[PDB]
């Protein structure tokens, strides 16, 4: 398996 996560301002 795996993991993934991502994040951005508006």
Same mark, same amino acid.
Do not use: K
């Given at each position: +398996?795996?993991?993934?996560? +991502?994040?951005?301002?508006?």
């Amino acid at each position: +398996g795996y993991r993934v996560a +991502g994040y951005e301002t508006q």
